[PDB]
Amino acid sequence: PRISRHRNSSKTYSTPKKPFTKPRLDAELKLCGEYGLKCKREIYRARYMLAKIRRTARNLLTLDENDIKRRFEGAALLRRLHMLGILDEEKDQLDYVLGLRIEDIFKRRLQSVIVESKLAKSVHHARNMIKARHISVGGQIVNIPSYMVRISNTSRVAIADTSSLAPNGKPGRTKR
Amino acid sequence: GITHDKMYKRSKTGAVQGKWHKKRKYNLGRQPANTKLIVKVTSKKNEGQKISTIRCRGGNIKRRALRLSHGSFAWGSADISHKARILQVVYNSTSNELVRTNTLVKGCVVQIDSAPFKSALSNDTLDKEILDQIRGDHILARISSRPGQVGTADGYILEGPELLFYQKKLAPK
């Protein structure tokens, strides 16, 4: 009854076991300073995505080589991590997936990519520009600062053609 | 109505069972209809052969015999079989009450008129035990069919060591 019931849903964040650890409160604030994050949930999501990927890597490393699952599932984890750019292209092994940080999840995010391309003066600048849809990846405008681009789309990231090139010519304050 | 369900029965250990459901049409049982033999044909003709069809599962009609008077009786050795009036029920293994009321049930020893089988007397060397019953006008036979389900009272003439067992049972009277 109601196909809505059959639609799935999941939690994408994992709160810390201890919430008031001073070393782990300060480090999260630094990781909000360099990445322009609104709330700690965004860092928790980053650790949930990394932990799952690391758990796949650890359950495959324990498995013997030439066991078919290690060859197939491991190649699919590596390919995904290479396509996103989380895994450096040169490493090409399962062990290097275990030795990764949430810095690699954050770097692929669009807000950090715009600063690297020098389009954004800061990460705080980029967040506002993406909310104002001034950024297009591969010809598609994005409004999400956690879009996370793939290595191929890195070059195709550009200022939205219809936004800051002034095709409108009367944008916001200029109009009036 | 009547139920052949084992839910009412106790377990092997003798424990009580639990009534998880109400009675179902599939586990229905029907009131038994004892085929009474019409031995009163001379007294009245109002009681004629009355067989009643009943509606069952799958629309499979079952013929229930309420009153019967005749049956096809077969002497297997001689291969002589003829429709014969059934005179009386003498001996039923389950109870003597069925013999008194003259109910026709499968395996009830019945006495049949020998007038159809009178021809067999002419050929000798055809089982002396059957032949002297033929002369007497009553032959020991047993109903071989179920009157309640089939609607007929077909049988066979008791022969060999069977005839001896049932004639010994009815020997004193």
Partner: protein, 260 residues
């Protein structure tokens, strides 16, 4: 539940139909016909889902009612009509003729055939019985009862029906060295020659079949379906039931996406 079940839930319907979970609460329930619910796909799914000739269920009725579709050469107007292994699904107006065989994964595949192929239909004799006055009769998987079968044809053999005349054109026996496609079961679609017949009296006969690649596959003899004596004598899917491994399947998927 008081009687026969007239409805099928989408989550309940068999996986080989490949019905999307969000598509509906309900799934098409096949009518009773030549094939069983598990061993058949309805005509609505073989038209609206595979060929997309009808974009909605009402349009499947409109094209089925017009007898445009022909199944085994029969008009077969029922929307939920079962279509199964070896049935000839041909639409003359679009000039397309299809024979339903099983693919390597195990889903049904509408294979393009030729006019000579369309004429014959392959059937497996499940049982030979003395019914109707002790007259000999055979029973094929597609619910076909043929009286007076050739005395030799045994059970498990494959007969070929003329369709127009409904006569057995030829019989292929079930024996070692005979081309067989396993219909149903974990090994489904796979094509191989019988290499072993293990009786296991009182239970199920276990048939081991060998692919051209040399991969040995074992299945119960009910699923096994003889195709011919040394060659299929029927159209076989492009894969020809060699069956790919998971790493090979990954490679074919990557190749297809790259040429987008």
């Amino acid at each position: 539940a008081r009687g026969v079940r007239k409805h099928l839930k989408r989550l309940n319907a068999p996986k080989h139909w490949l019905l999307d979970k969000m598509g509906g609460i309900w799934a098409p329930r096949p009518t009773n016909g030549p094939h069983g619910l598990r061993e058949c796909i309805p005509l609505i799914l073989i038209l609206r889902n595979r060929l997309h000739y009808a974009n909605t269920y009402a349009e499947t009725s409109m094209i089925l009612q017009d007898k445009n579709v022909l199944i085994d050469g029969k008009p077969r107007t029922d929307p939920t009509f079962p279509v199964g292994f070896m049935d000839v699904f041909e639409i003359p107006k679009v000039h397309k003729t299809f024979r339903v065989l099983y693919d390597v994964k195990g889903r049904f595949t509408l294979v393009p055939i030729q006019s000579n192929e369309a004429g014959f239909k392959l059937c497996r004799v499940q049982k030979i019985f003395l019914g109707d006055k002790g007259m000999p009769y055979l029973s094929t998987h597609d619910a076909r009862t043929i009286r007076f079968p050739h005395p030799d044809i045994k059970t498990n053999d494959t007969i070929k029906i003329n369709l127009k005349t409904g006569k057995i054109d030829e019989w292929y026996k079930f024996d070692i060295g005979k081309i067989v496609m396993v219909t149903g079961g974990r090994n489904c679609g796979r094509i191989g020659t019988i290499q072993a017949i293990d009786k296991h009296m009182g239970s199920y006969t276990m048939i081991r079949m060998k692919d051209t690649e040399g991969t040995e596959f074992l299945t119960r003899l009910c699923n096994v379906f003889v195709i011919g004596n040394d060659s299929p004598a029927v159209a076989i899917p492009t894969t020809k039931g060699i069956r790919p491994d998971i790493i090979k399947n990954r490679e074919l998927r990557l190749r297809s996406i790259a040429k987008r």
